[PDB]
Amino acid sequence: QTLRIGYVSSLLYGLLPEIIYLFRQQNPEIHIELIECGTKDQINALKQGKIDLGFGRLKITDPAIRRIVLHKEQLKLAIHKHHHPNQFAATGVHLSQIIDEPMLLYPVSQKPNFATFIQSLFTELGLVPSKLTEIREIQLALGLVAAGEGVCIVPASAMDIGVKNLLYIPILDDDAYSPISLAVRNMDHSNYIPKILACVQEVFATHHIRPLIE
Amino acid sequence: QTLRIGYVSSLLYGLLPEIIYLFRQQNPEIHIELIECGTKDQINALKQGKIDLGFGRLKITDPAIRRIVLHKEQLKLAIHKHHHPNQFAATGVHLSQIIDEPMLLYPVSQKPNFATFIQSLFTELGLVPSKLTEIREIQLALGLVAAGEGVCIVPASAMDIGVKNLLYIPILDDDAYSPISLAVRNMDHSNYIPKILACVQEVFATHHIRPLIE
Ligand SMILES: [Cl-]
Numbered sequence: 001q002t003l004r005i006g007y008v009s010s011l012l013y014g015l016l017p018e019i020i021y022l023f024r025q026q027n028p029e030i031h032i033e034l035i036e037c038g039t040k041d042q043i044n045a046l047k048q049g050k051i052d053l054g055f056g057r058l059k060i061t062d063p064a065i066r067r068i069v070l071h072k073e074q075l076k077l078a079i080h081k082h083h084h085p086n087q088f089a090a091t092g093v094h095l096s097q098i099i100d101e102p103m104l105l106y107p108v109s110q111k112p113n114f115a116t117f118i119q120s121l122f123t124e125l126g127l128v129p130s131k132l133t134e135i136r137e138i139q140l141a142l143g144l145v146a147a148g149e150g151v152c153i154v155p156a157s158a159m160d161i162g163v164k165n166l167l168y169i170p171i172l173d174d175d176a177y178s179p180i181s182l183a184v185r186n187m188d189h190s191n192y193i194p195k196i197l198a199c200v201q202e203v204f205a206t207h208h209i210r211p212l213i214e
Numbered sequence: 215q216t217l218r219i220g221y222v223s224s225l226l227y228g229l230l231p232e233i234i235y236l237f238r239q240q241n242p243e244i245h246i247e248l249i250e251c252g253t254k255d256q257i258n259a260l261k262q263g264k265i266d267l268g269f270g271r272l273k274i275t276d277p278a279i280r281r282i283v284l285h286k287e288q289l290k291l292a293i294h295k296h297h298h299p300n301q302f303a304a305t306g307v308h309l310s311q312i313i314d315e316p317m318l319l320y321p322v323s324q325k326p327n328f329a330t331f332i333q334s335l336f337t338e339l340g341l342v343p344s345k346l347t348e349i350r351e352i353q354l355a356l357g358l359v360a361a362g363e364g365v366c367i368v369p370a371s372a373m374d375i376g377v378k379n380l381l382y383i384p385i386l387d388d389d390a391y392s393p394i395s396l397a398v399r400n401m402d403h404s405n406y407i408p409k410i411l412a413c414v415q416e417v418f419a420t421h422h423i424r425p426l427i428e
Pocket residue numbers: 009010106107136137138139
């Protein structure tokens with residue numbers, strides 16, 4: 001049997017690869033195909049049987065799809081380490097403090113996506129970012145911050161991406177988090193679902209994190 | 215005036231963003247456009263005036279293009295930290311030791327590219343890698359190593375990419391390095407060329423590295 005798992009790349013800096021690695025060692029018989037797939041696109045891919053599991057980073061719902069929320073990652077503002085030493089405290093900023101700053105969004109894809117999500121955080125607060133640029137993928141955006149192209153809001157795990165000379169400052173607003181979720185077809189009764197969820201639990205426990213399931 | 219700079223993303227984990235940042239602060243008047251462009255594609259882009267500077271990671275020559283070699287990055291084998299504890303010594307491996315291992319190449323693009331370069335290192339030694347898979351971009355490949363998909367040869371600066379649970383082992387063969395080079399049109403006499411080269415020198419000196427120029 002072949003298990004097709006959709007994922008977004010920003011999740012590769014967190015616990016997901018560990019989870020897949022553990023699943024694989026526990027289930028060596030199963031052939032695993034990892035497939036890069038945007039969060040919205042995972043819905044249709046699941047429906048059409050092109051993937052069996054979808055790991056995504058923003059909330060999208062569908063009646064045919066069960067969304068299993070694993071964890072909420074706090075958002076951070078990535079800045080060049082010498083950018084605004086006084087007005088951007090290391091203890092954190094509110095989104096209201098950064099509307100004047102050149103801001104990098106990601107990815108470049110058909111919307112809705114993480115770029116529209118981040119924009120919505122401002123919109124629901126009645127804030128308007130003054131300059132937005134859409135960048136292909138998160139790692140590029142962080143590279144461009146270091147090169148002097150402004151600021152970029154990222155999930156906590158992106159703090160470890162190896163771009164030099166950055167600081168990652170907490171975003172203080174309540175709604176500023178990215179949910180890590182696992183999507184599956186509602187009428188899929190395969191044993192790989194409880195098996196992968198068991199692996200999620202083992203890895204989270206290893207790291208002293210309680211997942212939002214159980 | 216607008217300065218168009220081509221780059222490959224793997225260079226964002228090294229000194230390049232610092233260099234661009236310094237250039238920018240020293241030359242605030244100049245508008246800078248950073249453009250993602252493969253190393254071979256930078257040749258034609260320079261010729262057609264679509265970029266003015268091309269930062270690449272493999273050796274490609276053209277009579278109309280001046281190639282300025284800045285630095286040579288040693289290659290490393292990225293492995294899951296528990297993969298072959300005895301046969302892959304942390305002190306280093308020869309390419310001959312890894313031909314049986316599932317190997318991830320990158321990027322997926324029209325050849326020649328870094329994937330064909332890495333393949334050529336084996337070929338010139340009379341070695342044949344048993345299983346090669348081409349992956350879209352370096353960060354994905356490293357994520358897939360962590361998830362259990364095998365091994366991946368990367369430049370030294372990619373050791374800092376934030377994928378968890380990897381080890382990066384020296385490749386011992388003499389030809390196993392990636393040259394960082396700056397490409398320009400031979401008949402381009404703009405002052406941004408000596409200016410960016412001066413910035414390269416300042417940043418390298420900051421890091422106690424002697425560049426291969428001067
Ligand atoms: Cl992205």
